[PDB]
Design a protein around this ligand. Structure first.
Ligand SMILES: Nc1ncnc2c1ncn2[C@@H]1O[C@H](COP(=O)(O)OP(=O)(O)NP(=O)(O)O)[C@@H](O)[C@H]1O
Ligand SMILES: Nc1ncnc2c1ncn2[C@@H]1O[C@H](COP(=O)(O)OP(=O)(O)NP(=O)(O)O)[C@@H](O)[C@H]1O
Ligand SMILES: [Mn+2]
Ligand SMILES: [Mn+2]
Ligand SMILES: [Mn+2]
Ligand SMILES: [Zn+2]
Lengths: 173, 312, 95, 93, 1024, 173
């Protein structure tokens, strides 16, 4: 009875809307106690397109992405096309495994075609230039988190551990 | 289930021989190990729970009469489990997310592989953000002249902790969860001090994969060597094999035995797990069972925190 | 058991103090103090133990037995010491 | 209790860092290469540490009459310059 | 049957090759009557007639790159792209040429004279050792050519990159492959690298343990390659090139002395060897061994698919022959050495020490079975499917040797990820548990008493501590009287615990003549070597750290011999040298016969405690500066030498194309495509340079395959028709293969390697070795090891800046004085008119450790190696590249002194040299620091200058005005000067130099001007 | 380039008849040269569909499938149930490689439903039942490379090393 959406963080505003409901579910499997963004999900073999942000799956384990879980539905112009799988809360990869195990993990992932019309020359990156941090803290990390603005008094260290906790693989095409 | 060994101050885990004035015309020195050998933690926990008329010549038969199956050791900074990773003489503390794609990184071709290992041991390495060797030169003063003696000077490179750091070991037993929690141990050498913290922490063990990480030195039966050192590239992907001494026992005042081992942070392939079982006799099994008990033959999946002994 | 009791104390400097470490820091100083990992001054437990040991061996030049038991022995005939010092961490410097 | 950023500047400003000189007696001029710099920690500084002791019937004597009598000891070098006197207050007040 | 006719592969193209082409007077071309090899054919008089159909249609096209640079039609026709002049361009630097002049065989008579000189040295050998004459010729063919003054020639004036010799030896090396494929089938590449040498050298109390550790590292490999140099001749080793090899020449004339050769022709070549292979000292005749370990523990070999034991060469039976062979040969060398050690020990059961050697060798043979040092052997093979098309070579048959070599090294990388120490081969469970351990001395009250030299193995011999040793050695298994103590305590400091391997080291260091056991190699029986060693008893004294800390004091005492030993002559100091001792330490031989007994132990006289009141007072009265306890351990190495041998551009731009810029070269396309073209255009003056740059203009901007060559084929077809004797027309395709090759290079991002490349490199490497050898001895240093790129020497802290400056400038090939017979000149090495190139484009780093004489050498060596290997790859300094400040990595000098570190750049230009103006920029800061050191000695500037710069850096770094920073430094110097007006004037190109670090425990000021003062503080702490 | 199909090698043969070409193109994937199989492709995060042989993409970055890359046409019954990608030959996890890449290789890949009907759990499996080994050798391994058991006389170093080298992950679903 818990469905979440897998959302990634490129330097592109292309997941500006992902869900019809501002919160979605009724529990959080992710925590922020000012010490760290606990229970963040990484998946292997999934590189991401920037414009119309879509994880195009290249099956190279050296290509990954670090994205957070949020509940909701993929605008209902989707959910017949994105990935719809269930996990037993023992196989999901999670950094800073301090959070909650809901025992019910349904997940919707942006999932597209490999489209063998070019090659998947991938490119990783690390985020910086806090303006890039902020133009997504505005649209995601405060859009789903009413927890924000409540403990947000040491409002920097919650944003500093954003830098070294996320890295993806772009295609630059 | 889990035990955190929190050092109160820099620690010294020597690794080599003499550390005392023996040659009249030279100083002595020593250097600390970044991760204490599981013999150290075994001996510490044994010192906490001791009975004074048991063993007297075994040092691990009676020790195994006290401890559960100790599982390997690694760092935890702020809930950030750091894990040792060893190349030839290179040792680095890498976080978890850099071990998943690792088996593929050493199977990449030349330049990609070397660039990967380089950025791992050099740039994605986090050892030097948490720990830096802090040298401490000492002297002995003879009261007759109030001056240093005839080169009674020693340099001991300690282990400075640039931030709040613990060592993580898991222990099967639960009756001990109360008899060591909140104990101020004499952890490590040079008369240093650490503090113990215990809390139940479910950890998954029975898992099998293709590549493993030596969280603790993998001992070798001292007869399979010629069967092992010949085809080393077929058992360990990266890492370091070496001859180590198991330590120094207190009840007998003797240096413990010497065994060729595969040091921490080394990456062993699955073909070794059976190999040792194939290359160990029936009573050397009875001995290496205790060895694994005190925490030696510990492994871990590169995909998830899933520990695994070898002979068990 | 095995440190059943503890006594903390403040080391209040009456005169200036120098506890050397050689030329141990990348600084403009040739004889720096004993630094921490954070560069703050400290007194290593070795220096503290040795200084207090040497002092007590002359301020009570009959308790050699007790001091040698607690603070350890010098000559090769030895036995486990039974009192240790923690590195003196700087508390509060004047300003 | 200052912030850690400005604290390690105020503190490094409190530390004494003198230059000392070694003089040639027959001409009262500094000897070549006879100049170095030291670093004392100011008078009235306070360090903190603990004496951790096991219980073996000597501690009952050590920590009771030897320790009760200790107030002043000498720490570190350069005591001819008078750079070692220090006072131990036990946390019992 | 008899084969391997590479004697003509060394002679197919003569050293008279470039003057007979474009002759000035044209005499030899008419007095010998298919044009110029007539001369070589005439030179073929000592051995078999010339085979012409086996080494010009192959193994000459495959050896060098000229076959692909010029083109296989202009290469042979040798007349359609001409030039009058004759130059020689450094292989790494196509920028600087040479003026060859004309001192060469011109007359039909002097050529006969050089033939006669070859003959008289090669006429005393019979034919039973067919291979021995080729052996000696391989070495002396150049030594006679340059001994008699003759400047050496490039392969061709159309491409003056390779000297005529490297081309010849390269054709010979390829002949190992070409013979093995004209025969049934094979072709091999064998590489051998010793596992963990740095850890092994860092195992020993005394320097006499480091010396023999390095010497063993060299000698075991020499023993394994003795088999190859006797089997397939010397020209089977591609690294290190043994054309200027001390070990090889020693082995060679010792084998010639073997079997009986008149002791009148042995001298005619021994003088050649002593003058050029050495520098002019025959102490290897007075020491009986080569005094310096100079074999790099990493060798390569070109092996042929043949084998003996059919009494001649038959096809190899399997593809695991050489690996097993070298493994067994290595273990055999070690076992033979320890057997000879036991024999020589039993021959002297007296002397106490050797008695202990006896009675511990017999106890630990089962522990000495394992060599203390193991190797790692890889091999790669090739078949005629790869270099042949059933009638000739293929096209891309040139890129084979590269692809194989690039193959081989990669394998090593794989095996490198896992390091297994040698001590793991032992079996120490039953020993260290059940007390089976042999224990000569005190049975440890605590288990088994680890060793003190290696610190890892349980010790067998436990010398007691120095309380009352004479009454402590007799009541134990160490001694037998009061006499042996004075010789046991002579080589084992009281207190030392020794493992079997460490004691074997000490025993070999007791007399370094058993090493011949390995240097000769299956040549003499072990008993025959030992019976010489037990015949003569001349003492070989290796210094200690204290003997090198006390150099200046011994010097000051040889300038006051009688005065300072008037009050002496009761202390065994002014004692007359009574023995025939000698040392490989050149400074020792320079003295000792200068009035002072240099065999004394400063640890016993003034570095001692019970004494040195006496000695301090003595030194006081006689105006002697009481010594310092610090020496300096200098360690050097070239940067990206592997990348160099693989042809990369990283040695050229060390800091830009780092190592991952070959995992993808496209991101560094600009720099590689600038530098490679800058080099290719610049190699070959001739008439082809314009042709070549037109080919590149074609390649440049990806002009499609021959869709552009119509721009360039013109520039060839107009020229191919300047000559009529050109037999057939083949210009339609060669112009296509030329740009295919150039695109291959520019698109792979590295010069394709050929054997000529490798011999030309690893010969200049040994020449630089011979240069730095005489450099170290100039500065009263003591060479523990110095092979080519690397170096490990102990010097006094006083001549370390001078030495670093000189050695760096000489490694580039630029100096001021002559260094024996190697008269070095602005990027070349002039040996009596012979210009050999050097390594100016290569970067060399340094790692100086100012250590107390009593510091444990284990940790000193480990910290030196670690500082070098780590800091050289983690620190970046502002370098200017094409007038643009970038970041660089290598060419640093990392000083450390018990907690003080400093880094000194040595390049300041990322292509370190592109002209002749650069050769003074080399290490131009070390002489700035020197100038500043010679102001503080003279008392003009105060040492406060070093404790004052901080309150000037905070203002000097935030500044962007040059002429303001100049005033600022002048005022920082003005305020701390002691005389009227000093003049230091820092060169103002050091301002703004920014050093950085990738967050390591190394602390380093981020500006060169502060690293200068930290280096001065380190140096002066060395005089404490 | 000439296209290729990754075919997992399970205990079943519901994938055997999908790729037809015997000769192929300008290269090969494996190379039976007396050392064993070579260039074994491993896809992580993609468990196997035991029946109706397909690649069930989980988000666990720990499950690994052992198969082989076969040459050319997918029988043209695809382009609705399969997907096509063109890789630089460097985005694959090839095992104990021998052969030479062509730096560009069209790859096709099966795919199944993400199984929203049963808990996506998994178990390991190894090559046992020594008779089924030769059955898959003679079923598909010869349909692609028939020269097995034809020119090679050895049965142990290439033919009986799979017993521990092929190990994939079945959903039990
Ligand atoms: N004859 C020699 N004597 C002393 N040192 C040597 C000698 N030959 C090589 N070395 C040094 O040994 C090292 C060889 O390179 P490298 O192989 O990377 O080091 P290693 O110590 O051998 N370890 P490894 O790389 O695992 O083999 C370098 O530090 C060389 O300078
Ligand atoms: N291909 C090679 N052939 C022979 N010796 C080599 C080769 N590559 C490296 N060496 C030598 O092996 C030893 C260690 O090499 P190493 O220094 O690790 O490589 P490098 O290419 O020099 N890179 P760097 O670390 O910058 O010095 C030194 O003697 C090197 O000169
Ligand atoms: Mn090596
Ligand atoms: Mn190097
Ligand atoms: Mn290196
Ligand atoms: Zn030893």
């Amino acid at each position: 009875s818990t469905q979440r959406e897998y959302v990634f963080i490129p330097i592109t505003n292309s997941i500006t809307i992902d869900v019809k409901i501002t919160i979605g579910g009724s529990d959080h499997i992710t925590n922020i106690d000012e010490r760290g963004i606990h229970n963040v999900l990484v998946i292997t073999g999934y590189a991401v397109d920037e414009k119309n942000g879509r994880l195009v799956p290249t099956l190279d384990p050296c290509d990954y992405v670090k994205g957070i879980l949020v509940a909701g539905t993929p605008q209902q112009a989707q959910s017949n096309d994105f990935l719809t799988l269930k996990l037993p809360a023992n196989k999901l990869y999670l950094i800073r495994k301090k959070g909650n195990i809901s025992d019910d993990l349904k997940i919707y992932i942006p999932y597209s075609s490999p489209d063998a019309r070019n090659s998947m020359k991938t490119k990783p990156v690390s985020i910086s230039d806090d303006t890039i941090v902020n133009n997504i803290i505005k649209e995601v990390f405060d859009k789903i988190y009413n927890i924000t603005q409540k403990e947000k008094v040491k409002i920097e260290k919650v944003k500093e551990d954003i830098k070294e906790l996320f890295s993806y693989y772009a295609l630059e095409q | 289930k889990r035990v955190l060994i929190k050092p109160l101050e820099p620690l010294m885990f020597r690794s080599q021989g003499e550390f005392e004035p023996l040659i009249t015309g030279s100083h002595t020195a020593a250097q600390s190990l970044i991760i204490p050998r599981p013999s150290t933690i075994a001996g510490m926990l044994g010192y906490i729970l001791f009975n004074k008329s048991s063993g007297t010549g075994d040092w691990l038969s009676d020790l195994t009469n006290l401890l559960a199956t100790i599982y390997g050791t690694f760092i935890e900074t702020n809930g950030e489990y750091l894990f040792p990773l060893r190349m030839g003489n290179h040792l680095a503390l890498v976080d978890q997310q850099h071990l998943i794609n690792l088996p593929t990184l050493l199977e990449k071709e030349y330049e990609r592989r070397e660039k990967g290992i380089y950025e791992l041991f050099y740039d994605k390495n986090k050892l030097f953000q948490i720990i830096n060797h802090q040298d401490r030169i000492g002297i002995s003063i003879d009261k007759s002249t109030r001056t240093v003696k005839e080169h009674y000077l020693y340099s001991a490179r300690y282990l400075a902790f640039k931030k709040e750091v613990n060592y993580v070991i898991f222990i099967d037993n639960d009756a001990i969860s109360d008899k060591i929690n909140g104990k101020i141990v004499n952890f490590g050498g040079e008369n240093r001090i650490a503090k113990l913290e215990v809390d139940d922490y479910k950890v998954d063990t029975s898992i099998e994969e293709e590549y493993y990480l030596a969280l603790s030195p993998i001992l070798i039966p001292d007869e399979a060597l010629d069967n092992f050192l010949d085809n080393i590239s077929d058992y360990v992907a990266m890492g370091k094999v070496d001859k180590i001494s198991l330590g120094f026992d207190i009840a007998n005042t003797k240096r413990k035995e010497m065994l060729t081992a595969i040091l921490e942070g080394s990456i062993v392939k699955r073909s070794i797990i059976d190999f040792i079982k194939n290359e160990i006799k029936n009573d050397l099994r009875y001995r290496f069972s205790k060895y694994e008990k005190i925490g030696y033959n510990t492994l871990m999946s590169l995909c998830k925190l899933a520990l695994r002994k070898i002979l068990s | 058991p095995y440190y059943a009791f503890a006594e903390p104390f403040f080391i209040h400097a009456i005169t200036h103090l120098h506890v050397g470490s050689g030329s141990s820091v990348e600084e403009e100083i040739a004889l720096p103090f004993q630094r921490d990992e954070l560069g703050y001054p400290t007194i290593y437990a070795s220096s503290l133990k040795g200084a207090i040991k040497s002092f007590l061996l002359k301020e009570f030049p009959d308790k050699r037995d007790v001091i040698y038991k607690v603070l350890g022995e010098d000559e090769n005939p030895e036995e486990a010491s039974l009192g240790t010092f923690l590195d003196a961490i700087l508390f509060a410097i004047p300003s | 209790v200052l912030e850690d950023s400005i604290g390690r500047e105020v503190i490094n400003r409190s530390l004494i860092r003198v230059r000392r000189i070694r003089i040639d007696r027959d001409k009262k001029v500094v000897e070549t290469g006879g100049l170095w710099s030291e670093e004392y920690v100011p008078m009235k500084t306070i360090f903190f540490s603990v004496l951790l002791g096991k219980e073996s019937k000597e501690s009952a004597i050590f920590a009771s009459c030897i320790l009760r009598n200790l107030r002043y000891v000498i720490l570190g070098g350069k005591e001819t310059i008078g750079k070692g006197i220090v006072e131990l207050r036990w946390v019992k007040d | 049957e008899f084969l391997d006719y590479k004697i003509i592969a060394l002679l197919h193209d003569p050293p008279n090759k470039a003057w007979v082409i474009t002759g000035r007077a044209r005499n030899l071309t008419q007095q010998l009557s298919r044009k110029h090899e007539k001369v070589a054919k005439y030179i073929i008089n000592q051995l078999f007639g010339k085979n012409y159909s086996e080494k010009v249609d192959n193994a000459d096209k495959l050896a060098s790159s000229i076959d692909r640079y010029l083109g296989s039609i202009v290469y042979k026709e040798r007349s359609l792209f001409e030039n009058r002049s004759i130059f020689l361009k450094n292989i790494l630097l196509s920028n600087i040429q040479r003026d060859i002049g004309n001192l060469f065989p011109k007359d039909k008579s002097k050529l006969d004279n050089l033939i006669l000189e070859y003959k008289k040295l090669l006429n005393v050998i019979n034919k039973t050792n067919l291979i021995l004459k080729y052996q000696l010729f391989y070495l002396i063919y150049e030594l006679v050519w340059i001994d008699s003054k003759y400047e050496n020639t490039p392969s061709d004036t159309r491409n003056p990159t390779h000297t005529i010799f490297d081309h010849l030896y390269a054709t010979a090396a390829m002949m190992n492959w070409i013979l093995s494929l004209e025969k049934e089938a094979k072709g091999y590449l064998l590489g051998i690298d010793t596992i963990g040498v740095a850890d092994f050298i860092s195992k020993g109390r005394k320097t006499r343990d480091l010396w023999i550790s390095s010497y063993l590292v060299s000698a075991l490999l020499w023993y394994v390659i003795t088999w190859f140099i006797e089997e397939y001749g010397p020209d089977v080793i591609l690294f290190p090139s043994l054309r200027f090899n001390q070990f090889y020449a020693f082995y060679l004339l010792e084998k010639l002395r073997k079997e009986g050769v008149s002791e009148d022709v042995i001298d005619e070549i021994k003088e050649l060897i002593t003058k050029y292979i050495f520098n002019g000292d025959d102490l290897f005749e007075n020491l009986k061994i080569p005094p310096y370990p100079i074999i790099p523990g990493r060798i390569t070999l070109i092996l042929p698919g043949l084998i003996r034991e059919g009494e001649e060469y038959k096809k190899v039976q399997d593809d695991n022959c050489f690996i097993s062979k070298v493994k067994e040969r290595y273990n055999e060398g070690w076992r033979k050495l320890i057997e000879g050690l036991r024999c020589y020990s039993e021959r002297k059961r007296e002397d106490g020490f050797w008695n202990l050697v006896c009675r511990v060798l017999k106890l630990t043979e089962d522990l000495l079975q394992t060599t203390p040092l193991n190797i790692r052997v890889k091999q790669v093979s090739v078949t005629e499917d790869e270099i042949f098309n059933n009638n000739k070579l293929r096209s891309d048959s040139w890129k084979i040797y590269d692809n194989k070599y690039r193959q081989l090294v990669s394998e090593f990388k794989k095996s490198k990820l896992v390091k297994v120490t040698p001590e793991s081969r032992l079996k120490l469970f039953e020993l260290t548990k059940f007390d089976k351990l042999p224990q000569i001395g005190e049975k440890s009250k605590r288990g088994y008493e680890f060793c003190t030299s290696c610190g890892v193995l349980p010790a067998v011999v436990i010398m007691p501590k120095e309380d009352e040793l004479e009454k402590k050695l007799i009541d134990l298994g160490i001694a037998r009287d009061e006499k042996d103590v004075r010789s046991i305590k002579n080589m084992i400091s009281p207190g030392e615990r020794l493992c079997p391997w460490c004691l074997v080291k000490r025993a070999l260091g007791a007399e370094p003549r058993l090493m011949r056991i390995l240097l000769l190699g299956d040549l003499y029986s072990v008993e025959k070597i030992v019976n010489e060693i037990v015949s003569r008893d001349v003492k070989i004294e290796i210094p200690s750290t204290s003997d090198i800390a006390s150099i200046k004091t011994f010097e000051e005492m040889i300038e006051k011999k009688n005065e300072i030993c008037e009050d002496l002559k009761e202390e065994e100091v002014c004692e007359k040298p009574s023995e025939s001792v000698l040392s490989m330490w050149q400074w020792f031989n320079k003295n000792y016969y200068n009035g002072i007994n240099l065999t004394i132990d400063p640890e016993e006289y003034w570095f001692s405690e019970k004494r040195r009141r006496y000695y301090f007072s003595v030194f006081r009265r006689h105006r002697i500066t009481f010594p310092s306890p610090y020496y300096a351990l200098v360690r050097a190495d070239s940067d990206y030498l592997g990348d160099l041998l693989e042809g990369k551009l990283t040695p050229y731009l060390a800091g830009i194309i780092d190592s991952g810029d070959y995992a993808n070269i496209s991101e560094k396309k600009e720099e590689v495509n600038k530098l490679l073209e800058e080099y290719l255009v610049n190699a070959g003056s001739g008439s082809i340079v314009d042709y070549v740059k037109t080919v590149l203009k074609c390649i440049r901007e990806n002009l499609n395959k021959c869709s552009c060559a119509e721009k360039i084929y013109s520039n060839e077809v107009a020229k191919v028709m300047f000559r009529v004797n050109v037999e057939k027309a083949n210009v339609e395709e060669e112009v296509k293969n030329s740009l295919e090759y150039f695109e291959t290079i520019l698109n792979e991002g590295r010069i394709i390697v050929t054997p000529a490349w490798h011999v030309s490199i690893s010969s200049a490497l040994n020449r630089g070795l011979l240069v730095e050898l005489e450099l170290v001895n100039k500065h009263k240093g003591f060479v523990i090891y110095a092979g080519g790129d690397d170096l490990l020497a102990m010097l006094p802290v006083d001549e370390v800046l001078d030495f670093i400056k000189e050695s760096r400038r000489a490694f580039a090939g630029f100096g001021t004085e002559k260094l024996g017979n190697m008269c070095l000149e602005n990027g070349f090495v002039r040996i009596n008119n012979a210009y050999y190139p050097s390594l100016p484009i290569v970067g060399r780093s340094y790692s100086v450790i100012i250590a107390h004489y009593a510091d444990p050498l284990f940790f000193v060596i480990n910290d030196s190696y670690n500082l070098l290997e780590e800091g050289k790859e983690i620190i970046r300094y502002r370098v200017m590249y094409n007038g643009e400040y970038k970041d660089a990595k290598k060419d640093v000098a990392i000083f450390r002194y018990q907690g003080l570190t400093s880094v000194i750049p040595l390049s300041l230009k990322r292509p370190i040299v592109s002209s002749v103006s650069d050769f003074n920029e080399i290490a131009s800061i070390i002489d700035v620091i020197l100038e500043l050191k010679k102001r503080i000695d003279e008392g003009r500037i105060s040492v406060s200058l070093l404790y004052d710069y901080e309150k000037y850096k905070h203002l000097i770094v935030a500044s962007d005005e040059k002429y303001l920073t100049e005033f600022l430094v002048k005022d920082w110097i003005k305020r701390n000067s002691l005389r009227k007006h000093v003049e230091f004037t820092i060169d103002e190109k050091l301002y703004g130099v920014r050093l950085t670090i990738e967050n390591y425990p190394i602390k380093i000021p981020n500006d060169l001007i502060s690293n200068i003062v930290y280096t001065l503080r380190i140096i002066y702490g060395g005089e404490k």
